[PDB]
Design a protein around this ligand. Sequence first.
Ligand code: CLA
Ligand code: CLA
Ligand SMILES: C/C(C=C=C1C(C)(C)C[C@H](O)C[C@@]1(C)O)=C/C=C/C(C)=C/C=C/C=C(C)/C=C/C=C(/C=C/[C@@]12O[C@]1(C)C[C@@H](O)CC2(C)C)CO
Ligand SMILES: CC(/C=C/C=C(C)/C=C/[C@@]12O[C@]1(C)C[C@@H](O)CC2(C)C)=C\C=C\C=C(C)\C=C\C=C(C)\C=C\[C@@]12O[C@]1(C)C[C@@H](O)CC2(C)C
Ligand SMILES: CC(/C=C/C=C(C)/C=C/[C@@]12O[C@]1(C)C[C@@H](O)CC2(C)C)=C\C=C\C=C(C)\C=C\C=C(C)\C=C\[C@@]12O[C@]1(C)C[C@@H](O)CC2(C)C
Lengths: 171, 162, 185, 177, 75
Amino acid sequence: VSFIKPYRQDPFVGHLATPITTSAFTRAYLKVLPAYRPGLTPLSRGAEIGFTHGYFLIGPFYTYGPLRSVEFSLTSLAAGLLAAITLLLILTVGLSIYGQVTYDVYDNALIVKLVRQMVGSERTQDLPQIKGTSELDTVLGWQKFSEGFFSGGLIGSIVAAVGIALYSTYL
Amino acid sequence: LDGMIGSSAPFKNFDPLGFAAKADQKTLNKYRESELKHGRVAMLAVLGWIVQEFWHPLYDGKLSSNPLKALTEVPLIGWAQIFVAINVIEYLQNKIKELPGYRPGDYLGTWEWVEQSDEGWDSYQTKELNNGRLAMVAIAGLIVQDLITGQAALEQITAGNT
Amino acid sequence: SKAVPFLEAPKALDGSLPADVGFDPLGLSDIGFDFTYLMVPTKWDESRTGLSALKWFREAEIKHGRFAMLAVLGWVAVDMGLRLPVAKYAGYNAVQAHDVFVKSGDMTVGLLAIGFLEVVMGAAIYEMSKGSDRAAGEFSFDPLGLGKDPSKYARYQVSEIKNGRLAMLAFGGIATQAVLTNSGF
Amino acid sequence: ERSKSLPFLMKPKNLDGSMAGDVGFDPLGLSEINDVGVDLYWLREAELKHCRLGMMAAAGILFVEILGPAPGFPAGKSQMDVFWKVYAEKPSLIGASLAAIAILEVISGVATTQGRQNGDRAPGDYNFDPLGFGKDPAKFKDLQLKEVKNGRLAMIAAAGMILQGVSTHQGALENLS
Amino acid sequence: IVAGHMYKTNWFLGHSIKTILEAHKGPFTGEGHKGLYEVLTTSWHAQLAINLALFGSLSIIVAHHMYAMPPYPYI
Ligand code: CLA
Ligand code: CLA
Ligand SMILES: C/C(C=C=C1C(C)(C)C[C@H](O)C[C@@]1(C)O)=C/C=C/C(C)=C/C=C/C=C(C)/C=C/C=C(/C=C/[C@@]12O[C@]1(C)C[C@@H](O)CC2(C)C)CO
Ligand SMILES: CC(/C=C/C=C(C)/C=C/[C@@]12O[C@]1(C)C[C@@H](O)CC2(C)C)=C\C=C\C=C(C)\C=C\C=C(C)\C=C\[C@@]12O[C@]1(C)C[C@@H](O)CC2(C)C
Ligand SMILES: CC(/C=C/C=C(C)/C=C/[C@@]12O[C@]1(C)C[C@@H](O)CC2(C)C)=C\C=C\C=C(C)\C=C\C=C(C)\C=C\[C@@]12O[C@]1(C)C[C@@H](O)CC2(C)C
């Protein structure tokens, strides 16, 4: 037996079907992640990603910041929370500008078919081309994704701060 | 008790009680899943039993080297995290089980690459199954001996309580 | 078979070997391992077809029988006296003479001489494995000449193997009992 | 087909009848070695050199032990220990003898390899017949057989004397009685 | 000395490096070490690569073990 084969029977792609790229564990694990989980609107994907990211982002800032405390301090928690929230704001700014400069679409998975059927004799790159058919690959989709990331980041950072305070106080 | 993998020399197609002679393919897939999960968990349990007995670096020593005693000494908030990790792993396994072409114990998805399996692949799967069975028997014996005697594996062996 | 009638036969005990009655409950005469490879670990020669485990076992049984017969003769001799006409062999039984003579540098000489003879006759065994017509235990040693008359040779064969089995068991008893018929435990 | 010495063994292929003392006694088949510059020619030359060396050594030990040492030489009757007494007082004699033997052995090895290569010299042949004791044939074969048998016996004897002198630290005939 | 009696040279005894390498295949490695014997017996540069890498590593190991366990008197 051989556990490495050309990806999708194409020996010319710059890719391989290894026990890591195309394993059943990899398939299921990546399909349960918010970025690829089926049945999620882009706002929901952004909200979940932001929640998880703020939740694990408050950690390093609170623990190793400039205002640490070997005991529990409200000032240390506030400093870590503010740093995490501002980092989430910076990431949201990056997401917003990236989406602004990347896509020009409001409804995908159709425009591609329209220009593959009804011809696309225009300036292209909006009618024709169009990389990716996901709802995340639109101006509207990425805007809602960034909004969800930002809101979920705030909520997750607050939740993680509350959990840290409870763990440090009642344990 | 089929052309299934796991038939070794000492007892080929070992079904003395005929559990598989009447079961359909789905029940046999369930049986293989249960056997493989038990074998893997038992291999981990036996290795942990021994290593814990002669090495417990974590928790700043303490956590008495006898198993079934350190079971009641872990902070019980580390128990919760292990439980949640096992639960997430088995949720992922459940998600794997609905992938097309799924095989009972195959969570790596080897059916994607292994069409027309060889004798080496079958032999390695049988090796895993037999090691799992031996580890199941060994961990059952470990737990029973520690319950009845009160000493751990390398402690009972060292003293000579055999 | 002719012994243990509820077992038919091992597989290779057809009767081509002398003193054959068919007694082999464990089927030991069917191991596929050519024990000549315990001597010459590799095939070495391209003409080395191989030696059956049964023939190697027959050679080993004959050698064991001869060793045990000589051994019981010697052990019985040292129980009733009969020391060599030389010093340093006073009386020290048989349960203790072995160690005291291993100490006195002559059991090593005996080991060397017996090993020399064993190596020569094991070269004979290896040639038999290579495919010489020599049969197991046949070193062509008939100086006095009581080996002619093929019927007498076959009778003496079966006699030697049966006596060797008896002597093996008798030596086992004598060494285990530390002798009872001629001495004490 | 069977070796004359060992009837339970087939005739060693390389030993037909030619060499003096040939009775087919090659149980380990060492005559069939054809590697590391070792063959029947080299083995026979080594055997003959060993025979001659053992004869000389046994004769020397027996002579010195029976008739005593030469004038001006140490005594003691232990030939394995009197060597260090000779070296303690006449080291130059030992060194000169060693150098001479070394040169003669280099010549012997060169001669052995050359005679093996362009076959014209029998193994152990050095054209050393100053008194003409083996000129004619039908006596040369008998002399070869006598030399081989005496040399093997003296090889065994000299090895025994060496071991006895090293272990017991006494004379050969001293060990005898 | 024991390790020197491993590879088959002139008798029916020892190992063939070609047979050892060619038997070490695997599911993840395809043909495995097949052809490596031909590579290392027909290219001086491959032998130099292996020998020089292991030789430099050995020199560094020697350097460590030197001061770690001084092997000379008054060094
Ligand atoms: C069924 C498996 C199992 C279970 C329930 C336990 C349970 C325990 N172990 Mg343990 N252990 C195991 C296997 C197991 N062990 C194995 C296989 C080893 C060998 C590496 C060890 C080595 C070990 C040491 C050295 C120590 C413990 C200790 C402990 C105790 C505290 C928890 C801890 O720190 O774990 C620590 C566990 C590890 C460091 C290794 C765990 C590695 C896991 C089992 C493999 C990967 C699991 C993966 C997430 C799931 C599989 C993926 C896939 C197959 C689905 C606790 C009673 C500590 C103690 O107090 O001893 C008395 C301690 O110091 N264990
Ligand atoms: C298995 C055979 C065997 C063995 C191992 C021994 C061993 C021994 N015997 Mg012994 N013995 C035997 C058979 C044997 N005997 C037989 C059959 C007889 C009756 C004829 C005797 C009669 C006897 C006497 C009368 C005495 C001993 C003594 C001894 C001891 C002193 C000898 C010694 O130190 O080793 C020396 C080395 C050896 C014994 C190894 C044997 C090597 C032989 C000589 C090689 C040749 C064998 C021969 C040619 C075989 C021919 C077959 C083939 C070639 C055709 C020693 C423990 C003496 C003693 O003090 O015992 C307490 C003593 O006084 N034995
Ligand atoms: C390459 C080579 C030569 C060659 C070649 C050439 C040149 C290329 C030409 C051809 O083309 C090929 C070839 C291969 O032939 C090899 C050379 C040979 C060697 C390596 C020489 C070894 C000799 C050693 C001997 C012979 C020593 C013996 C020791 C004794 C000790 C005596 C004692 O008294 C002492 C001292 C103390 C006492 O208490 C007691 C004892 C122990 C008895 C007995 O004597
Ligand atoms: C067990 C044994 C043989 C058992 C045979 C059995 C069961 C046979 C059973 C059958 O035949 C019957 C009954 C009936 C058949 O129809 C069926 C079978 C089945 C065929 C032999 C032991 C044999 C055991 C032997 C030979 C042990 C020998 C030990 C020796 C010699 C020790 C020597 C010493 O050297 C040391 C070690 C130390 C020195 O200090 C001291 C001394 C004493 C000198
Ligand atoms: C090598 C030699 C002696 C070597 C001795 C050594 C190494 C001993 C060294 C030691 O003892 C010391 C020093 C001190 C100890 O603490 C250490 C040792 C090591 C123990 C003598 C050679 C001695 C060499 C001699 C005597 C040579 C004689 C040559 C003659 C007669 C030649 C004649 C011809 O040349 C003509 C005349 C005409 C030609 O055409 C024909 C011929 C016939 C060839």
